[PDB]
Every structure is written in structure tokens, then in C-alpha cells.
Design a protein around this nucleic acid. Structure first.
Ligand SMILES: [Mg+2]
Ligand SMILES: [Mg+2]
Ligand SMILES: [Mg+2]
Ligand SMILES: [Mg+2]
Ligand SMILES: [Mg+2]
Ligand SMILES: [Mg+2]
Ligand SMILES: [Mg+2]
Ligand SMILES: [Mg+2]
Ligand SMILES: [Mg+2]
Ligand SMILES: [Mg+2]
Ligand SMILES: [Mg+2]
Ligand SMILES: [Mg+2]
Ligand SMILES: [Mg+2]
Ligand SMILES: [Mg+2]
Ligand SMILES: [Mg+2]
Ligand SMILES: [Mg+2]
Ligand SMILES: [Mg+2]
Ligand SMILES: [Mg+2]
Ligand SMILES: [Mg+2]
Ligand SMILES: [Mg+2]
Ligand SMILES: [Mg+2]
Ligand SMILES: [Mg+2]
Ligand SMILES: [Mg+2]
Ligand SMILES: [Mg+2]
Ligand SMILES: [Mg+2]
Ligand SMILES: [Mg+2]
Ligand SMILES: [Mg+2]
Ligand SMILES: [Mg+2]
Ligand SMILES: [Mg+2]
Ligand SMILES: [Mg+2]
Ligand SMILES: [Mg+2]
Ligand SMILES: [Mg+2]
Ligand SMILES: [Mg+2]
Ligand SMILES: [Mg+2]
Ligand SMILES: [Mg+2]
Ligand SMILES: [Mg+2]
Ligand SMILES: [Mg+2]
Ligand SMILES: [Mg+2]
Ligand SMILES: [Mg+2]
Ligand SMILES: [Mg+2]
Ligand SMILES: [Mg+2]
Ligand SMILES: [Zn+2]
Lengths: 55, 165, 98, 63, 43, 102
RNA sequence: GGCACCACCAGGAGUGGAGCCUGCGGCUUAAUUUGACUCAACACGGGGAAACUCACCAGGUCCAGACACAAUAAGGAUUGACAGAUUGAGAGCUCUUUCUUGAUUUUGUGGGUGGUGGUGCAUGGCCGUUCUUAGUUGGUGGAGUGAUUUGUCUGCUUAAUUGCGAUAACGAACGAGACCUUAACCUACUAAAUAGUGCUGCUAGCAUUUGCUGGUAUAGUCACUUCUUAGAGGGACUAUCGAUUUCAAGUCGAUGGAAGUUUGAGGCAAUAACAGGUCUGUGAUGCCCUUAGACGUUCUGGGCCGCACGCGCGCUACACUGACGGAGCCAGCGAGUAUAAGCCUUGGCCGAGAGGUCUGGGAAAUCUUGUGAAACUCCGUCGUGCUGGGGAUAGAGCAUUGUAAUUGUUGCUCUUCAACGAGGAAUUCCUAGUAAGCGCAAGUCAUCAGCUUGCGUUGAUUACGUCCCUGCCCUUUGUACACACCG
């Protein structure tokens, strides 16, 4: 009944199908190399992940 | 499972970033400095640097044992595949992480900013730092916010050496 | 929350014996992968326990880190009617390494 | 739309009295054609609703 | 610290905290029945 | 399962430890009379990510350009399988991972 | 005084003029969510929204209100429910309906918790701007009762407070420069069966001279590192020689050199500051609002695209230095998957196409891939004509993705074939592999790139000067301002 309606809409292959690892966001996601992080969350973790600015 | 070379090195990096913040939230009060992940055959050595190595292994190492179990249950690691060691930072004054966390525990005690700020300027130099500068920004009883700067000694600003020293 | 007594039990014999619990933030997940019940049941059951000072809760990167207080071993000692030989698994006095 | 009210449980006060009868100096009566599904069995009775009989454990109706 | 005081009595008070803590910490370094079984004994 | 043409693949982000492990293995493959091929410098892979600087949407359109380098080297050895594995444990380095395929 | 293509000069390409794409305002709306308004708002919020995203609109569910109490409560506090009515709905949402579960829980009190609700004028962090301009600071000494000042300057020079020099200053620090990354050189080392080559086995075609083009080769268990890759080094320091100059810092010419504009390009980047922008990135936050008829969250449908209009970032073009039609046929930067939830996809076979199908390769210098790309070149048709330029608008039909394409996602086929005949006042960008064309890859991404971030192909005209406009810095000056002219 309700369990068959609650959260019933498909939530795959979409922008709402995925989220940031750190800030559960839907906008500004980075999917390269399987990061799955918001673009804002990436900046605050880039040094920790191993991404540095050289050029 | 089968992970490409480009994504596998990234996954190891992503693992470090998420693990480091977990320690920052849990072991903030023990002057957590940083973490070193020493991969090895048949074991995953993890080295945590903290100001206080009594908290991290409390009550017959209750905390480190109950804390290493929290990592086996979240990353689906074998129970024997990870071992956590707590190592003392030798020179606390040269670690800005310890000095900033130490500052937080004093500011939250209602202590004046000036007493807290001069407490880290002199503590860093005593450990032998070439220079140190502390900036504190925010609101304190007053509605308007302000930022203060206490410099000391020699500080460099531009180029590669800021990433080195 | 309305949890069957049996599903609440499995949450307690996972928290005791490995006095730490990790839960991903998804409410509609069928199985918390360690406790054969809904993942949401684990979050709300332990939100009460941390609400009543029996477990500490830490949250980082959309993950829950539940750890059992020393006060909580005594609580499950009596309510679960378990033998008074406790030592969940974290409190096995395994001791660290120097 | 007008404000709605959620449904509230409606007993009978001892609904169970009607499920059994006692023959003077007897044995069990078994009045409400207990469900034959493996889920239920004894103690789970059908429902003398109308042109159907419902058991609450496994949601099924008869005739 | 918006005054000639509370930073004066902030410096000498701030610095004596570290000297006491550097020395205390540098001295701190110079010196430094199971369960599942009970669930199975129902034989 | 005796002598074996064996390939060892080395990948890491940092070249100093990669070349030390690479040189240490070549050194240990010298005093031991083994025949070897390498090290072979594979084309380095530049993992580049270009984001916007602004967390919000205001200002001059300024971008970060983060970088990651993956250097991969493969060395071919002609030795029995038992011998090569103990060389790996001798020249174990936390940063560099090793995969060995026959 | 000085510097500067976000200023000009000499010039190039343009934009503004047309159509369309897209953003902003406005109007409209049931809602057309919202931030941003000169540079520093308007292809910006990585904002290319069919659902989600989503915050808006019209409706419909759930508590996922922890916890201490109090009440109710096993003689049952409460939860799930077939069938029919009801509903957009096979939502027990609600109503008839009696079945089921069992102290988990229902009601009241406090207390919570959650908000893309408000406040960026309460804040953290981050970011943009003054400004990447060249500026900033202290010790000792001189001056001053002092706040302060000199040092930090007439001149020359430089990209530069960067140097020469003058000198009540002398000797220094941040910033600049140094530093880091990338591109160009090394037949000198180090090696490479995931790179390439000559020989050599074996092999094809053509002329027969033994030659020229190929294929094969993971055992030829060959030779080599020039081309390819990348680590250790080397190499440029304005070197030598001419001119000028205070004979100083330097500058301009030659010669050598791979490189002689800081060798080219970037990354980092000082003292302060702005009510600059974000609480619509955050399980970052203070406070206010809301919290069961929710502003939480979820389902269905619509909207963010809506159209008498003004403005900004762009794409096709207005033709012949061209359109087509055949033929020739060269890059670089990169990415790529598993019991998934499906990646990059060659090769074969169908189909005019779009596309479909069967196998195989590749977690990758191995396979897609030499990404055989486009401008471009050769030969033809066209022949100054709103023409074969241009391809909107629209009709009919064929495929792909997706639950779902209607307000056409996109692609293909035929047909229709509009403005536009080089654009007023204005205004933008730019100095060498630069501008301009021309495409390709990566991000977004189930599908959609007229967008950005990069990459390479073809490849110039015209300066290498100045303060005339514009902006900024310095010096002098005035000041009744210091919340500093938003006075
Ligand atoms: Mg205080
Ligand atoms: Mg420096
Ligand atoms: Mg520099
Ligand atoms: Mg987090
Ligand atoms: Mg001009
Ligand atoms: Mg714009
Ligand atoms: Mg939608
Ligand atoms: Mg919806
Ligand atoms: Mg919402
Ligand atoms: Mg929030
Ligand atoms: Mg701010
Ligand atoms: Mg002085
Ligand atoms: Mg003086
Ligand atoms: Mg004096
Ligand atoms: Mg200077
Ligand atoms: Mg071979
Ligand atoms: Mg440079
Ligand atoms: Mg502001
Ligand atoms: Mg503002
Ligand atoms: Mg937004
Ligand atoms: Mg609602
Ligand atoms: Mg809301
Ligand atoms: Mg919409
Ligand atoms: Mg829009
Ligand atoms: Mg519309
Ligand atoms: Mg722009
Ligand atoms: Mg154009
Ligand atoms: Mg042609
Ligand atoms: Mg290739
Ligand atoms: Mg052509
Ligand atoms: Mg025509
Ligand atoms: Mg045409
Ligand atoms: Mg057309
Ligand atoms: Mg003209
Ligand atoms: Mg102009
Ligand atoms: Mg202009
Ligand atoms: Mg779309
Ligand atoms: Mg694309
Ligand atoms: Mg865009
Ligand atoms: Mg002027
Ligand atoms: Mg004055
Ligand atoms: Zn995020």
C-alpha cells in the first residue's frame, strides 16, 4: 500500500540517483575517476586525496 | 574488485581523505596532528599522530580497540587486515594542527583571545619554528565580526617553499 | 518507532559483542548488511540508545559511527537477561601494542 | 479540501468470546473456520465479514 | 582584548601556560567470559 | 613451477620511491646471477581535474586545475617463482604497490 | 611624473545590423522557485531542468516527534490489512468490513529533531575585487616635545621599490625576483616482446640484375635505442664582438646557438580592505520563522522553456579566396567495465540513412585508435541569379535513450525554402605559431553541446611606440572628511 508508493519513483541513471560522498549533494557532482564528490567538497579534500595545483 | 589503475590510486587517496576527517571529528580533543597509511603484506598499518597518546588508548586500550573495530565494520576489511598504532608527536610546537586544536579548547573555556593567541605564538617558537602567524576571525559578544593577526619571526608567502616548510 | 521485539533483539546482539556499529545513511535500504533488519531500524534504535546515554554517536561522510559506552554494557547485561560475564568484544582487554 | 482524521482501532471488548463456544462438559469448539494457510493455523480465524472470509496474518479471502 | 589590560595579563598568563606545558609535556616524554558461548550452552 | 619469465608491474604517485624499489630490485638481480629486462618507463598518466574556484557563482570566471601523476614501470625477470616473491618483501615500500603476473 | 591592447597609436578579426541558440529584465502565469546589476551581475551559481534534480504551482501519503514524565493500556496501548465504496492511483488515505500484531507503542507536558524557509547587514570557511599593479615593514643612527618622518629619493634603467647612482643615512625582511609545473635541445649515459627500426627465418605482388613495394614473426629464445616513452644528468649566463650611456645599471645590433621578447606558458604570490557573493555545497554555523493541515520528507501531474517588447555571452551566413560531387588524407590533449545494473567499442552481417544484430579486444603505450577529424589539396558541375549562397519555419514518415519525449530530447529521409545582398551612433579582443579560421577529446551526460575546460591542423596584417582618450600608481597640494564624498 503505502510502502509501494513511498519512495516509489525510480531514482536511477539520474542526477538524484547519485550524491556527494561528503555533503549528500546533487548539484556540481564530479564523476571522473569515480570520485562522486561535490565540486565544493573536492576543493577541501584535494590535498588529502592527492590532487595538487602545479600548472 | 577489478578497478582501473587511474581509479585505484584515486580510491586509495579518497580513502585517506575520508579517514582523516573521521579522526579529526573523534580525536579532536587529543591534539590529532595527521595520519599515515602504511600498506604492507597481510596487514594495513595506520599511524595516527596525536598530542595525547593516553586518550587514544584509554582503559587498557579500550578506545583504540573499539575504534579500530569501527573501521573494519565500515570498509568491509578483514578483522586482521588492519592494525592501528598511536604515535606521539615529538615536537608539538611545530604542529599547527595541535596548536589550532589546543586553541579551540581554550577559546571554548571563556578565556580571552589575547591570552590564547600569545600562548601559541610563544609555544611554536619554543619548539624551534622559524615563524608563525595566527589569524582569528568571527564574533565575540559583539554583533560585528572582526579578524586579528599576531605575527612573529620570519614568514614566507610566495612560491613552492610554502608547500615544503 | 515501531520495531518488532525480535528485530530489536538482533540490533542488540550486534551492538553487544562488537560494541561498535556502522550504518550508512539510507532509510529505504532493506538490510544494513550486518543486522538482518531494515537499516532505518538500526539508526532509530541506536538514536534512542545514544539519546539515553548508552552509546556515543559520530557522523562523518554520510556514515554513522556508533560506539558502546561502559554504561551500556551493564544495561544490556540486565535487559537482555544475558549472563553477567560480559566483555562485548571491544572490551576483551586485548590491550594495545607499544 | 476539508481536514481529514486518521482511523482509530475499534475493538469489541473481548472479541474473542465470540470465536469459541462451550458445550456443557466438553472439549474445544473451533467456531470460526480457522485458516488453513501454513502461516496461520490454530488461533488465527477467518472473518465473518460477508461474501468473504479474511484472516489478518496472511491477507487472503475465501468464497 | 580591546585594552591595554587583558592582553598584558594575557601575555604573561599565556606564556606561563606554555612554559608549564612544554616542561610538563617534555617531562611526560622523558619519563614515558565471552558471550556467544553462553548463547550456545543450551544443550 | 621452477624458473619463470615473470613480469612485475610497479605503480605509484611518487617517482623517488618507485625508482628506489626499481633500483633495489635491479641491484639484487645483479649480485644474484639472474637475467632481467627493465626498468621500462611507461608513459606517465596525468589525471587532471578542472573545477571553478568560486564555491558560489560570483566573480571572475576563475578555475582550479588539479593534477595527479601515475608512473608505471614493468620489469621482466627470469627466476623461479619462490625467488621473486621474497625479493618483493625485501623492497617493500608503503607508497608503491606491486602486482606480479605470470 | 609613470605604467598598461581589461588604454590609445598602426593594423587584423569582429560585435551592435539578419535568423537562430542561450542568459538578464519585463509582461504573462496556478507556478513560470531563486542569487547576482559597471568594470568586479546578464553560456555565471560548474544552472546543457521531460521525472529526479526542485527550492515553484495543484493535489495525495509517512513520522523517520529521540528521551523523562503523566494519562490510556493486556478484559488489549497500538500496527499492518483482502473485498466493495472512495481516489489520479492495486495510497487500509478515508469509509462499510471483522481479521490480525502485541507494550515496540496512542494522547497531554516539557524537550527534541529536520528544513533549497529568512537573515551573506549576525558569522566561519571559500571565492571575486583594489591587483598581480609593485607595493609593504621593522633595527641602529639623524630630525621632531610629540603624533610622525628620513631610510622608502632628483636622474637613468627595468616587467618590477629592479638595479645603477645621489645620498643623514647604514645595514636588512615580506612582496618582486628567486621557487614549482609544462613545452622546445641531447645520435652522451639508463633501459624497453604494452614503442619503434634493420637484418634475419617465412612469405607475397611488379621488372627479371642482385632491384622496388608489401604481409607475416609473443621464439629469429637475433642486432640497435635515432625516431617513442621517462630518471639521472648536461645545456643559456645576454656568451663573444660592435655601437651608445653618468662609461654605471642597461638598451639596440650582428656571430655562434635548439633556445638570446624574464627562452615560451602558466602555478604560488605581501601590508592592510569591501557590509563584494555565497547560510541554494556542506551532518559549517548564531539568531528569527516553521515543525504533523510541516515550509521536513515522499508520490502523481505541471513549471523553471511559458511571449506585443529592451539588453548581454554566442552559432550559421550573406558567397566564385564560394557552394556542392567525387577523389587525395594528416594531429594532439584525453577516457574507458563484472552478477554488473552495465564502460570504450573494432570486426563480420543487415539497413539509403539514422540505426540494428552476432562475435571479439580492452580496467588499458597492448583494444576501441594512426581516434584515416575538419578546414585543406586535385579534378569536375554551377556561372553573379535571393542562384546549386542561406537553411530558419513547417508537413509527412523512419530509429535511438528513457518508466514516461505531448510543449516536436536527439538522430535520419523527403518536401517547404523566411530574414540576410557585409550592417548607424557606439563598442570589444589582440603582437608570433599570436589574431583569425578549422575541427577533436574531457566536464556535464540514460538522451541532448550552438557552453565551458583543454588539445592539436592551416596560419597572417600591423606596432615593438606614446600619454592623446580611459584606468591605475607615485609625488606635490587643499580639506570644516576619519562611519573617511555612500563624508
Ligand atoms: Mg571571553
Ligand atoms: Mg621568497
Ligand atoms: Mg614568482
Ligand atoms: Mg560530512
Ligand atoms: Mg584602434
Ligand atoms: Mg557571462
Ligand atoms: Mg521534473
Ligand atoms: Mg515531483
Ligand atoms: Mg523540499
Ligand atoms: Mg540544511
Ligand atoms: Mg564572508
Ligand atoms: Mg628608527
Ligand atoms: Mg630613530
Ligand atoms: Mg628627539
Ligand atoms: Mg623593494
Ligand atoms: Mg615477438
Ligand atoms: Mg616560470
Ligand atoms: Mg561583505
Ligand atoms: Mg552583500
Ligand atoms: Mg543553486
Ligand atoms: Mg506534505
Ligand atoms: Mg523546505
Ligand atoms: Mg519546472
Ligand atoms: Mg533558467
Ligand atoms: Mg511552455
Ligand atoms: Mg563569459
Ligand atoms: Mg559568426
Ligand atoms: Mg567538396
Ligand atoms: Mg593510440
Ligand atoms: Mg571541399
Ligand atoms: Mg536557394
Ligand atoms: Mg544551400
Ligand atoms: Mg530545413
Ligand atoms: Mg565592408
Ligand atoms: Mg577599441
Ligand atoms: Mg575598452
Ligand atoms: Mg534536456
Ligand atoms: Mg561532449
Ligand atoms: Mg554552462
Ligand atoms: Mg593619462
Ligand atoms: Mg591632511
Ligand atoms: Zn557535496
Amino acid at each position: 500500500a503505502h510502502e509501494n508508493v513511498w519512495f516509489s519513483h525510480p531514482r536511477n541513471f539520474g542526477k538524484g540517483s547519485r550524491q556527494c560522498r561528503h555533503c549528500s549533494s546533487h548539484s556540481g557532482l564530479i564523476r571522473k575517476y569515480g570520485l562522486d564528490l561535490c565540486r565544493q567538497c573536492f576543493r577541501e579534500k584535494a590535498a588529502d586525496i592527492g590532487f595538487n595545483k602545479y600548472r | 574488485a577489478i578497478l582501473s589503475k587511474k581509479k585505484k590510486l584515486v580510491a586509495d587517496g579518497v580513502f585517506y581523505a575520508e579517514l582523516n576527517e573521521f579522526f579529526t571529528r573523534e580525536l579532536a580533543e587529543q591534539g590529532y596532528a595527521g595520519v599515515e597509511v602504511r600498506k604492507t603484506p597481510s596487514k594495513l598499518e595506520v599511524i595516527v599522530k596525536a598530542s595525547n597518546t593516553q586518550g587514544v588508548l584509554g582503559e587498557q586500550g579500550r578506545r583504540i580497540h573499539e575504534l579500530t573495530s569501527l573501521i573494519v565494520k565500515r570498509f568491509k576489511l578483514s578483522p586482521e587486515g588492519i592494525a592501528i598504532y598511536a604515535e606521539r608527536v615529538e615536537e608539538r610546537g611545530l604542529s599547527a594542527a595541535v596548536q589550532a586544536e589546543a586553541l579551540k579548547a581554550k577559546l571554548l573555556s571563556g578565556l580571552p583571545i589575547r591570552r590564547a593567541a600569545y600562548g601559541v605564538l610563544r609555544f611554536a617558537m619554543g619548539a624551534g619554528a622559524k615563524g608563525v602567524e595566527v589569524v582569528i576571525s568571527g564574533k565575540l559578544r559583539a554583533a560585528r565580526a572582526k579578524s586579528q593577526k599576531y605575527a612573529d619571526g620570519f614568514m614566507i608567502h610566495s612560491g613552492q617553499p610554502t608547500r615544503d616548510f | 518507532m515501531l520495531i518488532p521485539k525480535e528485530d530489536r533483539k538482533k540490533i542488540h546482539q550486534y551492538l553487544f559483542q562488537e560494541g561498535v556499529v556502522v550504518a550508512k545513511k539510507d532509510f529505504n535500504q532493506p538490510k544494513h548488511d550486518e543486522i538482518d533488519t531494515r537499516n532505518l531500524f538500526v539508526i532509530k534504535a541506536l538514536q534512542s540508545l545514544t539519546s539515553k546515554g548508552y552509546v556515543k554517536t559520530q557522523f562523518s561522510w554520510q556514515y554513522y559511527y556508533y560506539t558502546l559506552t561502559d554504561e551500556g554494557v551493564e544495561f544490556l547485561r540486565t535487559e537482555l537477561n544475558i549472563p553477567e560475564g560480559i566483555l562485548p568484544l571491544t572490551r576483551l582487554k586485548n590491550a594495545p601494542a607499544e | 479540501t476539508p481536514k481529514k482524521i486518521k482511523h482509530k482501532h475499534r475493538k469489541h471488548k473481548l472479541a474473542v468470546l465470540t470465536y469459541y463456544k462451550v458445550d456443557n462438559e466438553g472439549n474445544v469448539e473451533r467456531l470460526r473456520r480457522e485458516c488453513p494457510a501454513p502461516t496461520c493455523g490454530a488461533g488465527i480465524f477467518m472473518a465473518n465479514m460477508k461474501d468473504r472470509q479474511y484472516c489478518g496474518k496472511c491477507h487472503l479471502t475465501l468464497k | 582584548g580591546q585594552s591595554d589590560k587583558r592582553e598584558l595579563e594575557g601575555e604573561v598568563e599565556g606564556t606561563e601556560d606554555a612554559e608549564a606545558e612544554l616542561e610538563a609535556e617534555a617531562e611526560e616524554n622523558d619519563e614515558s567470559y565471552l558471550a556467544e558461548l553462553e548463547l550456545s550452552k543450551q544443550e | 613451477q621452477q624458473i619463470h619469465k615473470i613480469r612485475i608491474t610497479l605503480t605509484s604517485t611518487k617517482v623517488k620511491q618507485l625508482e628506489n624499489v626499481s633500483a633495489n630490485i635491479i641491484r639484487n638481480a645483479a649480485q644474484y646471477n639472474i637475467v632481467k629486462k627493465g626498468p621500462v618507463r611507461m608513459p606517465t598518466k596525468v589525471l587532471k581535474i578542472t573545477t571553478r574556484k568560486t564555491p558560489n557563482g560570483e566573480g571572475s570566471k576563475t578555475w582550479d586545475a588539479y593534477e595527479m601523476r601515475i608512473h608505471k614501470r614493468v620489469i621482466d625477470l627470469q627466476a623461479p617463482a619462490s625467488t621473486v616473491k621474497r625479493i618483493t618483501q625485501i623492497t617493500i615500500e608503503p607508497g608503491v604497490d606491486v602486482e606480479v603476473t605470470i
